[PDB]
């Protein structure tokens, strides 16, 4: 039962609904493609974003938009939970919230191949 | 014979226990040589119609 002003407007009751339902990454994620891109500026892909941010294997994870907004999430909090859940053994390099594709990039840094699969599950 | 006594009492145990409980888990049920298991004392008062 909602308490204050949230009880009337459907808008301010909707973010309560977001603050209670269980959202993991699988609900917002779309495509997970691990890669052996050795040189992080080389980026076997078309992405000029790493070149502004600067191990040879990554996890390009491209997110969803109509799933990322309908729960109202930004990449800063995903990026923060993404290193707070695994500590400083990883280095997420998020996109910006202007581009059309919502890509994350993970890399390990410090049986190595399967490990990005082990932590991506 | 100090070795057969062991089997004698194993079979005595089987009989005296299936007298008061015919259903044991993992134990052969004492049947009559008509082929039907017995009604032990526990079954005479076990469930409905005890």
């Amino acid at each position: 039962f909602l308490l204050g002003q949230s009880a009337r407007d459907a808008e301010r009751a909707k973010d309560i609904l977001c603050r209670l339902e269980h959202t993991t990454l699988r609900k917002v994620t779309a495509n997970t493609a691990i890669y052996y891109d050795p040189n992080p500026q080389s980026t076997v892909v078309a992405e000029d974003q790493e070149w502004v941010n600067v191990s040879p294997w990554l996890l390009r994870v491209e997110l969803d938009r109509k799933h990322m907004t309908d729960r109202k999430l930004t990449m800063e909090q995903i990026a923060e939970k993404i290193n707070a859940g695994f500590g400083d053994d990883l280095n997420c390099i998020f996109n910006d919230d202007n581009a059309e594709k919502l890509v994350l990039r993970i890399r390990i840094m410090n049986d190595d191949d399967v490990f990005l699969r082990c932590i991506e599950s | 014979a100090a070795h057969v006594i062991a089997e004698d009492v194993k079979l005595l145990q089987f009989h005296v226990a299936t007298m008061v409980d015919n259903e044991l888990p993992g134990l052969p049920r004492a049947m009559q040589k008509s082929g039907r298991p017995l009604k032990s004392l526990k079954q005479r008062l076990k469930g409905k119609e005890g």
């Binding site: 779309a30 495509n31 997970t32 890669y35 076997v44 040879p56 | -």
Partner: protein, 116 residues
Amino acid sequence: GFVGIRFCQECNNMLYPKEDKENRILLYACRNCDYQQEADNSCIYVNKITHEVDELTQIIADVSQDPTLPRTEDHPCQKCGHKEAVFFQSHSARAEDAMRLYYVCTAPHCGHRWTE
């Protein structure tokens, strides 16, 4: 896209991806064999969480001779221009939320399928 299984050339077993720790490249070596062949995809495992599937890839053209499948004459083919076409819904488990129809041209040697 994807990655396939690419099989060995000596023992015809499955090649694993293995990073070359000297020249900085991605290889595919074997377990039973000592066969190193040089990769080209530079993509190892891909995963469609959306599981985005196109149904037109699964439609065989042989459906058009199904007596039990409805026929229209209001959607004509595009390659041939036949008037008859059969139509059906995804007919798949795991149909996410769609009651979309699929058409197949009911004319032999065509089997063109399309979605509207």
